[PDB]
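subagent[fold] <- orchestrator: predict structure for attached chain, return C-alpha cells only, no commentary.
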Amino acid sequence: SMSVKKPKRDDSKDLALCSMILTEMETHEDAWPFLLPVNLKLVPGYKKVIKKPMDFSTIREKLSSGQYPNLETFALDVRLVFDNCETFNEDDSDIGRAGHNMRKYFEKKWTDTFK
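subagent[fold] -> orchestrator:
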C-alpha cells in the first residue's frame, strides 16, 4: 500500500531474457504455424472467430518497441498464440499438436527462467 512495499525484485534483465525465450520459440521446428500473422484474407473464419490474433513476429515487434510494460503482459501474448491455436485447430492435426508442443516448451522456459 502507500509507503509499504515488498522488497524490489530485480527486473532489469527481464527484457533480454524474454527476447531469449522468444528466440528459442522462433527457432523451434514446430514454430511454423506461429511465426507470422494468420492471413485473414486467405483463411476463412479466422477474422470473425479469433478476436485477438497473435503471432511470434508481432510479439517480437512489440517487445523490440517497448510495448510490453512487464514480463506478465509478454507471457499473456505468448499464451494467446496457443489459446488461439486451440480455438481454431483440432487437437489431432499437425497445427493442433504444434500448439500443444510449443505451449509446453514455453511454459518450461518461463518457469526455469523466472520461477
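orchestrator: received. Logging for downstream: The domain at 1-115 is CATH 1.20.920.10 (Histone Acetyltransferase; Chain A). The chain has one domain: 1-115.
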